Design an enzyme around this catalytic site. Structure first.
Site: not given
Length: 330
Positions: A35, A199
């Site tokens: 994770d 992004s």
């Protein structure tokens, strides 16, 4: 040194991925959920409340000659989905894909929440976010990666998650045969303890690319792609019959649909998520309403590039002095 381990979907939907991890001496192999959105390595154990264990493989520290109780140390974690676990702490030898760390903090669960109990395939978590998020008290502990880093050939790990197929976590090297084209690197902020990046925008299907900054985290422990409501609405508007259902808890769509792809930007590069990656199947057995793999982050408080996004790429987690993230198509 390096390590290389195969990671395998737990079910037919790629809800999560498990990777075998050797703990203790002799080795006890547990299948852990790696994770990158958390920083605790915790396991089901001989100390876990018996009624809360249902099929998991447990770590038994008393059977490991290298286990040592970390005196006074406790841990307690709550995840974004409301699941939780807590317990005490041992140090022991931990190996992943041939890479060995001695003195790793292995957090032994005394209590786990129902979602963990109900998932027989996950024996614990191995956190790969920054050690500043580790919950051990009163002395915070380091992640497996943090402990291994100095010994690695290069201070990196990579995630290459498969779509309905196994993939790979590598430590200490970049497998140049595992991706196409070049890797585009992008800046990371560690201020919140996550692999947080921005992004450069998105496209829906064959549509034009929208240049817009989307700050979010690269999180292998989250199944879906969570993005701003504007972006998500634009995506589902291209699917006939799709709607946001408050009763179901997100966007659903007719199972008869063909889903469009979703593209996200990494600098000037583009990662394409095929439409089929966005299908999470019937909302309940036999239903013709299917659950979407792109969902709104509104009210999470952060955008999350979870498995839906990451499995479309070869992803480099670069833990150099100034960390960065790299993405390549594959």
């Amino acid at each position: 040194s390096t390590g290389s381990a195969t990671t395998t979907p737990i079910d037919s939907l790629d809800d999560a991925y498990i990777t075998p991890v050797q703990i203790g001496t002799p080795a006890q192999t547990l299948n852990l959920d790696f994770d990158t959105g958390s920083s605790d390595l915790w396991v089901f154990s001989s100390e876990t409340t018996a009624s809360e264990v249902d099929g998991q493989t447990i770590y038994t520290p008393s059977k490991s000659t290298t286990a040592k109780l970390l005196s006074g140390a406790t841990w307690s974690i709550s995840y974004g989905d409301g699941s939780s676990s807590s317990g005490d702490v041992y140090t022991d030898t931990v190996s992943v894909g041939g890479l060995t760390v001695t003195g790793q903090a292995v957090e032994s669960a005394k209590k786990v929440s129902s979602s963990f109990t109900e998932d027989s395939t996950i024996d614990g978590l191995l956190g790969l976010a920054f050690s500043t998020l580790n919950t051990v008290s009163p002395t915070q502990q380091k992640t497996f990666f943090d402990n291994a880093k100095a010994s690695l050939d290069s201070p990196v790990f990579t995630a290459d998650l498969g779509y309905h197929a196994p993939g790979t976590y590598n430590f200490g090297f970049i497998d140049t045969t595992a991706y196409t084209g070049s890797i585009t690197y992008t800046a990371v902020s560690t201020k919140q303890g996550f692999w947080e990046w921005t992004s450069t925008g998105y496209a829906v299907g064959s549509g034009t690319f929208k240049s817009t900054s989307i700050d979010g985290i690269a999180d292998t422990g989250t199944t879906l792609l969570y993005l701003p409501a504007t972006v998500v609405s634009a995506y589902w508007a291209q699917v006939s019959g799709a709607k946001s259902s408050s009763s179901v808890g997100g966007y659903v769509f007719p199972c008869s649909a063909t889903l469009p792809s979703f593209t996200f930007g990494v600098g000037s590069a583009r990662i394409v998520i095929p439409g089929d990656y966005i299908d999470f199947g019937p909302i309940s057995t036999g239903s013709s309403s299917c659950f979407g793999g792109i969902q709104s982050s509104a009210g999470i408080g952060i955008n999350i590039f979870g498995d839906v996004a990451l499995k479309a790429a070869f992803v480099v987690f670069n833990g150099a002095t100034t960390p960065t993230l790299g993405f390549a198509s594959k």
